């Protein structure tokens, strides 16, 4: 399902918690209450998961932009020593850009 | 100084760091004219905020705020024994920028942060 594919992707975003360089990070709260600190691309995707569950986007349209975010993130490798992308985050953007 | 002109001043200084010793590596960036520079990690993130400003993603004030935040952290790291002898040009850069009082400079004419020193 398009729906179940989305709930896959945000289960991956959860596990990118604390996978940050020396600088940077994005705080997002769950429905669980738990706060997580995640990379820029993964945060932009988490935001599209919110719009979806808030009836602002369809599953189809949410998943489209999610994949489009991942593809742009995959291309970006401008990172310095102080804000390195972790390998776990790199695999996530590759996986999601595949779909 | 306008915020715009302060940014242009900082980035002229970043360009002069081309080739100078970063002990934690280097970062290639390309100028608008096409020329490629190799600069340290703090200068490179400062350069990236300049780009975000030029693309209209940040205001001049918001760009300078993070530029100065990065130069403060980079200056603190540069005072360590590992780094504080062998990268002087990089040290002077991060020291100048970290000493900018932004909100006072936007009042006025470059204004510096007034503070106590043990001396
Ligand atoms: O905002 P920054 O200071 O650049 O911080 C980096 C970004 O959040 C990166 O997001 P990305 O993977 O989507 O590029 C992340 O992977 C890094 O670990 C952070 O250090």
Which domain, by its residues, includes B12?
3-105
Measured CA to CA, the distance from residue A76 to residue B14 in angstroms comes to: 22
Q: Please calculate the CA angle B79-B80-B81 and round it to the nearest 5 degrees.
A: 120
Deposited resolution, Å: 2.5
User: CA A76 → CA A38, A68, A71, distances in Å?
Assistant: 16, 13, 9
What is the distance in A from the centroid of ligand 1 to the CA of A82? Answer: 9
Q: Residue B12 contacts by C-beta under 8 Å, 6 or more apart in sequence?
A: none
Measured CA to CA, the distance from residue B56 to residue B73 in angstroms comes to: 25
Q: How crowded is residue B94: how many other Cβ atoms within 10 Å of its Cβ?
A: 25
Number of domains in chain A: 1
Which residue of chain B has the CA closest to A82? B41
- Which H or E element spans position B71? helix B60-78
How distant is the Cα of A8 from the closest Cα of chain B, in angstroms?
A: 31
How distant is the Cα of B73 from the closest Cα of chain A, in angstroms?
A: 10
Q: Which atom of ligand 1 is nearest to the CA of A90?
A: 12
From A15, A73, A79, mutation site for ligand 1 pocket: most ligand atoms within 8 A of C-beta: A79
Instruction: Tell me the three state secondary structure of residue B38.
Output: strand
**Which of A40, A41, A62 is CA-nearest to residue A53?**
A62
Q: Experimental method for this entry? A: X-ray
**Cβ atoms of residues A47 and A77 within 8 Å:** no
The DSSP result for chain A, as a single string, is -HHHHHHHHHHHHHTTTT---SS--EEEE-SSS-EEEE-HHHHHHHHHHHHHHTTSS-HHHHHHHHHHHHHHHHH-----GGGPPPHHHHHHHHHHHH-
Strand partners, B112: B100
User: Does any domain span residue B118?
Assistant: no
Token output for A96? 């999601």
Measured CA to CA, the distance from residue B66 to residue B63 in angstroms comes to: 6
Task: Phi first, then psi: give them for residue B55, nearest 5 degrees.
Answer: -90, -5
Measured CA to CA, the distance from residue A59 to residue A70 in angstroms comes to: 16
**Which of A20, A36, A7, A5 is CA-nearest to residue A89?**
A20
Q: Residue A50 contacts by C-beta under 8 Å, 6 or more apart in sequence?
A: none
**Cβ atoms of residues B40 and B17 within 8 Å:** yes
Tell me if A24 CB under 6 Å of ligand 1.
yes
User: Does any domain span residue B34?
Assistant: yes
């Amino acid at each position: 399902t398009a729906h179940d594919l989305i709930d896959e992707i945000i289960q991956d975003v959860i596990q990118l918690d604390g996978k940050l360089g020396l600088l940077g990070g994005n705080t997002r709260q769950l429905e669980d209450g738990r706060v997580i600190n995640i990379p820029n691309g993964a945060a932009m995707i988490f935001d599209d998961y919110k719009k979806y569950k808030q009836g602002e986007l369809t599953a189809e349209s949410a998943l489209e932009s999610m994949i489009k975010i991942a593809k742009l993130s995959n291309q970006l490798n401008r990172h310095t020593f102080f804000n390195q992308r972790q390998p776990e985050t790199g695999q996530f953007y590759k996986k999601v850009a595949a779909i």
